[PDB]
């Protein structure tokens, strides 16, 4: 009886929040860029951060201000303190009484008055000024909330009797659901009233807190003169279950919304979203008497696209059906056939609009598996699309491939595992890939009824491969397209973007070709080779792209010597930069050959000498323009004895330098415990030659346990002026890195250092000297000295002499930070703590997140400005009551010393102060 009472009882969960807060600022800069970075790269926790960490948009705690109640993001350029503070953002008044906001330090540059608006002289001269000061008037807030949770025992459903011509028994199937429900008192700030059914908040839908006054917030509170507060009670629930399965042994029928299914690639790659609402039936004949050892299986799908959706949507009156059948006659070779169809009904043929084909009918067969020591992967498809309209003129498009290679479990092809193995280690000829491709030009995700895909995933990386992990397009080979200059509006000149990149028009050409990658394992020797030619579907050599190559390695004792030859002959246009540095579209010929020798004495040390020679379009081509990466079979070898693996990808980042110019911390990464500067490569294949010693601390029997350094020298070829055939190895790069953690006593030291003396502009790094050093100390609590002190520390210096074609400017930075925590302070359970941080910078800047996956970074700019961010943060604690105080100042002067901080132009820095009293309480 007690269990029955508990099953359907409410758990009452009240919550109380108590806290005092005051904050005064004049510019709202950011202070999270001063705090130490943890070994996982996260910044140390403080009581002043505004938050804002978003992985989707790349936002971090360092992209927003931390004072007042405002989280104003930092603004790049001069409007912000070069990414250090908030923008100036004048306000512009209009004649009709409307207003706009101008984001700049000079309103005169407001070159965007709308068509009919005229600046009315209402403010200073029609331009106002948005106040840069934010205030949080000191107050103590008590927040009270209450929720009612359920026992969570309603996770099952049992079927009931049904039927009209008959009556089912009932209680035959038990389904596990994922319903999470309870009672809430108040609505979240992000709730809304969805009046359209799209499931998303359209333009100002309802603001559910505004629909139910008194639900939450401060705008409305349903009160009582006696002091009572009333809040509406809502029933909140999530239903994560949309599929219901019936039947156990041979036959299982699943009914639900947005059914996800997969016949094969090129036909019903309809998982990762699903296609619509309906049912799927799966029949497994693995226990049949006569034929059950072949594991016969049948799948059948019926559904309506997107369920019910309004007209003008692609899935209105459109229904899909399909059936697949497969077996495994041999060890693992599964062979299957499948029929798929999608079409409009009489209500979709009329009043649907869009462009969905009147009918698509695809047939196919596939032969994936591993049977007799070899792995086969084949696929055939036929489309027969009915292109709506009136005449239609049904169009057919096939897609066939046959590959002898190893597919992973995620259906991506692993080209590093042979799958042939025609011998042992002494004589070990290994076939890695042997494939043919006949994808037609008109075969897209509509031809074979899928969600996405069947197009080059990169067009710059391996562009014959359609495999797209983002959209779940599991398909080995892609529908290639031909690229050409656009010339949309202007005539005579090709259209370009603002950055100068070309604008291309892509026409699908399909794909047809073959490719073999193999390697023969000798004894102390090993050899490998690859060949690959792909044309358009029609076979015209105007779209051919052939890559051939081969490598040979000899490794013995502690010496290894490799030699690689790579070619790329692309009559296919290809987009790339020329010698001058302007993007172009046109055929390419790349010839590379690299001989690199390595010696490993075994004491953790290593030495490496290399000579790599690129040759683009017949000229020596100081740097290849990424063309060699257009093929998916690169297959270089690796140094070391007994390492005869022919792994795909030309390891161009081997024994060469790094060209990074961005960093999370103020100093050039030498103060970031999540960045190993000695393992930073450029990943660009150069026409150069050089040597590089080093030392690894993770390798056992090393001189120093945790020590890594990467001293190295190199010389890079550069043409005579810009495009001359003649040239010389005049460029010179001398680089060095070091990293040493150690733990002397109770403290935990960490040293990092980097150097560079480049002579030319390699990828984006200018030509000049570049050095950096950083030290991090973190003492554990001392149990001998009174107060149990626990110290910290941080120092970082960065220097760079950027010799760019527009200046010879020096960009240096200096970051420091110290702090001591007293874990035993007078009264019991009393703690005190103080941390002082500082960051000075010459011509450097911060670039905030771009709103995409890219994050913000500190870089060098020629802005003649010196930033002087400083702050002190004192955190004391009684038993569990935390007093946090913080005072920070940001001043950005110029060479003269004008002190542009606090940009009202009064010669005063921006200042921020905060005081908080925090107290966490639980019921």
């Amino acid at each position: 009886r007690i269990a029955a009472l508990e099953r359907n009882a409410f758990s009452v969960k009240p919550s109380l929040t108590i806290g005092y807060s005051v904050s005064r600022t004049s510019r709202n800069f950011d202070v999270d860029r001063l705090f130490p970075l943890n070994a996982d790269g996260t910044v140390a926790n403080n009581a002043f951060t505004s938050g804002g960490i978003d992985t989707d948009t790349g936002a971090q705690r360092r992209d927003f201000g931390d004072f007042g109640n405002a989280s104003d993001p930092v603004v790049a350029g001069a409007a912000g303190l070069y990414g250090f503070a908030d923008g100036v953002s004048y306000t512009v008044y209009f004649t009709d009484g409307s207003t706009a906001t101008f984001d700049g330090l000079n309103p005169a540059d407001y070159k965007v008055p709308t068509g009919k608006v005229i600046d009315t002289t209402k403010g200073r001269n029609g331009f106002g000024f948005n106040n840069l000061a934010r205030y949080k008037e000191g107050s103590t807030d008590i927040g009270i909330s209450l929720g009612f949770d359920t026992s969570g025992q309603f996770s099952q459903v049992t079927s009931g009797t049904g039927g009209s011509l008959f009556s089912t028994a009932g209680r035959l199937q038990v389904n596990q659901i994922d319903l999470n429900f309870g009672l809430v008192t108040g609505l979240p700030s992000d709730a809304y009233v969805d009046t359209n059914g799209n499931g998303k908040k359209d333009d100002g839908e309802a603001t559910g807190r505004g629909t139910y006054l008194g639900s939450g917030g401060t705008a409305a509170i349903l009160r009582d003169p006696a002091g009572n507060v009333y809040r509406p009670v809502f029933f909140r629930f999530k239903n994560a279950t949309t599929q219901f399965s019936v039947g156990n042994n041979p036959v299982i029928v699943t009914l639900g919304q947005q059914q996800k299914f997969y016949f094969s690639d090129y036909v019903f790659d309809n998982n990762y979203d699903g296609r619509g609402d309906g049912f799927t039936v799966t029949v497994d004949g693995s226990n049949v008497p006569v034929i059950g050892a072949w594991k016969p299986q049948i799948k059948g799908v019926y559904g309506s696209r997107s369920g019910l959706d309004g007209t003008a949507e692609a899935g209105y009156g459109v229904y899909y059906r399909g059936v697949r059948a497969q077996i495994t006659p041999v060890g693992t070779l599964t062979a299957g056939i499948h029929y798929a169809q999608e079409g409009r009904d009489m209500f979709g043929a009329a009043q649907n609009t869009t462009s969905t084909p009147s009918d698509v009918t695809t047939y196919g067969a596939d032969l994936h598996g591993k049977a007799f020591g070899v792995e086969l992967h084949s696929e055939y498809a036929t489309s027969r699309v009915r292109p709506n309209t009136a005449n239609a003129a049904v169009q057919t498009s096939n897609a066939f491939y046959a590959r002898v290679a190893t597919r992973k479990d995620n259906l991506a092809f692993d080209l590093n595992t042979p799958a042939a193995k025609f011998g042992n280690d002494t004589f070990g000829v290994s076939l890695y890939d042997l494939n043919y491709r006949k994808i037609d030009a008109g075969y897209n995700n509509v031809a074979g009824i899928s969600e996405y895909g069947y197009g080059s995933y990169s067009r710059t990386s391996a562009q014959n491969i359609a495999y797209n992990p983002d959209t779940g397009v599991t398909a080995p080979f892609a529908n290639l397209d031909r690229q050409a200059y656009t010339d949309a509006n202007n005539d005579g000149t090709s259209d370009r973007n603002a950055d100068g990149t070309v604008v291309a028009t892509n026409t699908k050409i399909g794909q047809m070709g073959f490719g073999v990658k193999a390697a023969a394992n000798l004894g102390p020797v090993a050899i490998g080779g690859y060949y690959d030619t792909s044309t358009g579907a029609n076979g015209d050599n105007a779209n051919r792209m052939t890559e051939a190559g081969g490598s040979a390695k000899v490794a013995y004792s502690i010496f290894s010597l490799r030699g690689t030859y790579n070619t790329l002959d692309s009559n296919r246009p290809q987009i790339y930069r020329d010698a001058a540095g302007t993007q172009i579209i046109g055929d390419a010929k790349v010839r590379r050959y690299a001989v690199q020798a390595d010696v490993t004495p075994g004491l953790g040390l290593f030495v490496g000498a290399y000579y790599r020679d690129v040759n683009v379009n017949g000229v020596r081509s100081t740097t290849d323009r990424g063309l060699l990466g257009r093929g998916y079979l690169a297959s270089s070898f690796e140094p070391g004895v007994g390492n005869n693996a022919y792994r795909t990808g030309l390891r161009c980042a081997d024994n060469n330098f790094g060209t990074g110019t961005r960093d999370i911390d103020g100093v050039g990464g030498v103060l970031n415990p999540a960045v190993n500067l000695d393992q930073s490569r450029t990943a660009t294949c150069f026409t150069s030659y050089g040597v590089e010693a080093g030392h690894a601390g993770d390798n056992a029997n090393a001189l120093v346990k945790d020590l890594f350094f990467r001293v190295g020298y190199s010389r890079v070829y550069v043409p005579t002026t810009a495009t001359a055939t003649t040239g010389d190895f005049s460029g010179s790069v001398t680089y060095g890195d070091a990293r040493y953690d150690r733990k002397v006593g109770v403290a935990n030291v960490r040293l990092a250092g980097s150097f560079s003396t480049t002579n030319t502009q390699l990828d984006s790094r200018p030509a000049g000297t570049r050095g950096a050093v950083g030290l991090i100390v973190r003492t554990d609590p001392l149990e001998n000295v009174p107060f149990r002190p626990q110290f910290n520390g941080q120092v970082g210096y960065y220097t760079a002499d950027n010799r760019v074609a527009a200046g010879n400017y020096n960009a240096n930075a200096t970051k420091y930070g110290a702090g001591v925590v007293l874990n035993d302070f007078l009264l019991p359970q009393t703690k005190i703590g103080v941390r002082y941080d500082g960051y000075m910078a010459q011509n450097r800047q911060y670039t905030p997140f771009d709103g995409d996956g890219t994050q913000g970074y500190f870089s060098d700019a020629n802005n003649n400005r010196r930033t002087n961010l400083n702050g002190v943060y004192v955190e004391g604690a009684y038993q569990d009551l935390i007093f946090s105080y913080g005072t920070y100042t940001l001043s950005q002067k110029d060479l003269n010393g004008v002190e542009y901080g606090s940009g009202i132009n009064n010669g005063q820095p921006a200042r921020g102060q905060t005081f908080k009293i925090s107290y966490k309480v639980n019921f």
């Binding site: 009886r1 269990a3 029955a4 156990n248 042994n249 041979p250 226990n287």
Partner: peptide, 27 residues
Amino acid sequence: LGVTRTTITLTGMAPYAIYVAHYHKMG
């Protein structure tokens, strides 16, 4: 075919108690 439904109907048991029943192997 390959599944087993088992209906143990018990009577004269304890008024409102829970009765977890399963299959104990030979041991």
